[PDB]
Amino acid sequence: MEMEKEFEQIDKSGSWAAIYQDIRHEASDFPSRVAKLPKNKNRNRYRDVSPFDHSRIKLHQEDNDYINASLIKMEEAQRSYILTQGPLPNTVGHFWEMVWEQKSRGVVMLNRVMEKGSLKCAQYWPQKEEKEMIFEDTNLKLTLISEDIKSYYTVRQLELENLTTQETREILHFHYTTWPDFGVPESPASFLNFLFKVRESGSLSPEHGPVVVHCSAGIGRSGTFCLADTCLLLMDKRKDPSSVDIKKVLLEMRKFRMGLIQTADQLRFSYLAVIEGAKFIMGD
Numbered sequence: 015m016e017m018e019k020e021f022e023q024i025d026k027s028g029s030w031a032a033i034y035q036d037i038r039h040e041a042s043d044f045p046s047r048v049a050k051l052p053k054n055k056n057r058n059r060y061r062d063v064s065p066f067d068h069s070r071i072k073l074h075q076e077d078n079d080y081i082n083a084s085l086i087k088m089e090e091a092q093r094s095y096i097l098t099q100g101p102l103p104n105t106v107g108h109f110w111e112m113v114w115e116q117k118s119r120g121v122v123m124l125n126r127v128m129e130k131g132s133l134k135c136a137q138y139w140p141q142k143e144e145k146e147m148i149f150e151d152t153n154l155k156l157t158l159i160s161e162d163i164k165s166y167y168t169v170r171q172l173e174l175e176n177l178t179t180q181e182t183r184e185i186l187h188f189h190y191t192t193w194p195d196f197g198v199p200e201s202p203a204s205f206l207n208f209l210f211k212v213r214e215s216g217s218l219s220p221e222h223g224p225v226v227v228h229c230s231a232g233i234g235r236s237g238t239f240c241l242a243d244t245c246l247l248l249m250d251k252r253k254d255p256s257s258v259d260i261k262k263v264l265l266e267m268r269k270f271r272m273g274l275i276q277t278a279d280q281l282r283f284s285y286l287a288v289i290e291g292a293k294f295i296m297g298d
């Protein structure tokens with residue numbers, strides 16, 4: 015069923031809440047035993063948000079290999095994403111270790127450091143060229159190279175250095191700085207624009223490791239970003255794009271990380287983004 019028609023049918027009937035609960039009910043349940051070990055309690059921002067053991071990212075050290083991060087592998091779309099929580103004061107070093115070990119080119123950040131008057135994630139990148147950050151626990155150095163601040167998002171060029179081997183890489187930081195504190199954007203225009211900018215950079219492309227995507231928990235806005243990308247890619251690839259079932263893509267993605275898409279408003283916004291993105295691209 016063409017999703018644009020399914021959309022109006024759900025909208026006119028006002029059943030978004032009822033669709034959303036169906037997804038929650040049918041969503042996969044797998045063990046998260048490593049996340050719940052007592053040694054890992056201060057590596058988790060939220061007690062109800064854990065990576066599944068089968069899909070979790072492992073850090074390459076013998077000490078403690080745990081980070082709150084999951085590999086979403088979309089087989090038919092041929093895209094991989096790492097979804098992770100906003101780094102904590104004591105996991106900033108782990109975060110940059112993961113970026114290094116997985117050979118990621120881009121970090122996508124969908125939240126501001128402070129929202130609703132509380133801290134949503136650590137200040138994990140340098141704000142001034144001449145004030146670089148050193149992560150002593152993981153032996154990495156990070157330097158701000160340049161910053162391009164626009165109305166809806168900022169792009170930063172960073173240099174990440176492995177102080178052990180003195181190799182350096184360029185990492186791009188894509189910061190969506192305009193997601194409102196309550197609800198979802200009214201138009202998906204600026205979110206779609208930001209997705210095309212990430213694609214343009216080559217950060218989503220198979221010659222790199224998977225992109226690292228985060229908000230505060232790594233399931234809500236992060237969910238919306240990778241659901242929309244994968245759905246539009248599938249509409250490009252397949253002979254009938256009206257066949258693409260966003261609810262089926264979401265349930266497939268929820269096999270790899272729990273809770274993707276946190277509200278019925280985020281589900282609706284996901285439909286709108288894909289419906290609008292499908293157009294535009296479609297001949298322009």
Ligand SMILES: CCCC(=O)Nc1nnn(CC)n1
Pocket residue numbers: 130191192193194195196
């Ligand atoms: C929407 C543009 C970016 C922005 O400043 N968002 C924001 N900051 N506080 N709020 C309260 C709902 N919403």
